[PDB]
Design an enzyme around this catalytic site. Structure first.
Site, PDB file in Angstrom:
ATOM      1  N   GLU A   1       0.862  -1.149  -0.229  1.00 44.97           N
ATOM      2  CA  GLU A   1      -0.211   0.083   0.178  1.00 44.97           C
ATOM      3  C   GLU A   1       1.057   1.082   0.135  1.00 44.97           C
ATOM      4  O   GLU A   1       0.779   2.222  -0.660  1.00 44.97           O
ATOM      5  CB  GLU A   1      -0.779  -0.159   1.287  1.00 44.97           C
ATOM      6  CG  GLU A   1      -1.806  -0.770   0.947  1.00 44.97           C
ATOM      7  CD  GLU A   1      -3.188  -0.630   0.058  1.00 44.97           C
ATOM      8  OE1 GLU A   1      -2.944   0.646  -0.206  1.00 44.97           O
ATOM      9  OE2 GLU A   1      -3.978  -1.629   0.053  1.00 44.97           O
TER      10      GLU A   1
ATOM     11  N   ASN B   1      -7.693   8.552  -6.225  1.00 49.97           N
ATOM     12  CA  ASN B   1      -7.933   7.383  -7.126  1.00 49.97           C
ATOM     13  C   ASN B   1      -8.997   8.176  -8.301  1.00 49.97           C
ATOM     14  O   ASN B   1      -9.098   9.417  -7.860  1.00 49.97           O
ATOM     15  CB  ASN B   1      -8.991   6.696  -5.713  1.00 49.97           C
ATOM     16  CG  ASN B   1      -8.142   6.108  -5.314  1.00 49.97           C
ATOM     17  OD1 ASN B   1      -7.551   6.284  -4.510  1.00 49.97           O
ATOM     18  ND2 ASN B   1      -8.799   4.930  -4.470  1.00 49.97           N
TER      19      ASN B   1
ATOM     20  N   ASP C   1     -11.865   8.394  -8.631  1.00 52.21           N
ATOM     21  CA  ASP C   1     -14.006   8.331  -8.467  1.00 52.21           C
ATOM     22  C   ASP C   1     -13.490   9.727  -7.683  1.00 52.21           C
ATOM     23  O   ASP C   1     -14.480  10.101  -6.587  1.00 52.21           O
ATOM     24  CB  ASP C   1     -14.433   6.845  -7.935  1.00 52.21           C
ATOM     25  CG  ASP C   1     -13.697   7.274  -5.754  1.00 52.21           C
ATOM     26  OD1 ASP C   1     -12.507   7.910  -5.626  1.00 52.21           O
ATOM     27  OD2 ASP C   1     -14.150   6.860  -5.226  1.00 52.21           O
TER      28      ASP C   1
ATOM     29  N   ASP D   1      -6.217   8.051  -0.749  1.00 54.91           N
ATOM     30  CA  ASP D   1      -5.801   6.977  -0.043  1.00 54.91           C
ATOM     31  C   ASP D   1      -4.554   7.897   1.221  1.00 54.91           C
ATOM     32  O   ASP D   1      -4.088   8.891   0.216  1.00 54.91           O
ATOM     33  CB  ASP D   1      -5.238   6.139  -0.628  1.00 54.91           C
ATOM     34  CG  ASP D   1      -6.746   5.020  -1.520  1.00 54.91           C
ATOM     35  OD1 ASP D   1      -7.801   4.684  -1.368  1.00 54.91           O
ATOM     36  OD2 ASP D   1      -6.025   4.517  -2.997  1.00 54.91           O
TER      37      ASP D   1
END
Ligand SMILES: [Cl-]
Ligand SMILES: [Cl-]
Ligand code: NA
Length: 129
Positions: free
Chosen positions: A35, A46, A48, A52
């Site tokens: 990650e 992201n 959308d 993160d």
């Protein structure tokens, strides 16, 4: 902060992630490696429009407020910036909620694609834990 592998394992253990929802410490270390590469300051936008944040790349759509993710929730009740601290308390507290959400660690796509089913114990090999 860029954690050492065994350094992050020790912090995750102290914060009670070791075998949380039946996920061994190596699972958590592997997830953090893929990650964030163990970097608390990691951020990823992201498609959308959510972002993160932090060592476990916790997402603004559901878990933290960044004030720029329309129609989003803040279920960990924290600013997303709290997830970037050298202190991982907030990241761990919020990951405990995420992994309790019903899909376990599949919530981390990088865990599913790169950690799941692998020899995750290798991630804590050599550590004084
Ligand atoms: Cl490593
Ligand atoms: Cl909310
Ligand atoms: Na949000």
């Amino acid at each position: 902060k860029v954690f050492g592998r065994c350094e992050l394992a020790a912090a995750m253990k102290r914060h009670g992630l070791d075998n949380y929802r039946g996920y061994s410490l190596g699972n958590w270390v592997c997830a953090a490696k893929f990650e964030s590469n163990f970097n608390t300051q990691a951020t990823n936008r992201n498609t959308d429009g959510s972002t993160d944040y932090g060592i476990l790349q916790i997402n603004s759509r559901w878990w933290c407020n960044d004030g720029r993710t329309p129609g989003s929730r803040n279920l960990c009740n924290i600013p997303c910036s709290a997830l970037l601290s050298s202190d991982i308390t907030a990241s761990v507290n919020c990951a405990k909620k995420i992994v309790s959400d019903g899909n376990g660690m599949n919530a981390w796509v990088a865990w599913r694609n790169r950690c799941k089913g692998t020899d995750v114990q290798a991630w804590i090999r050599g550590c004084r834990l």
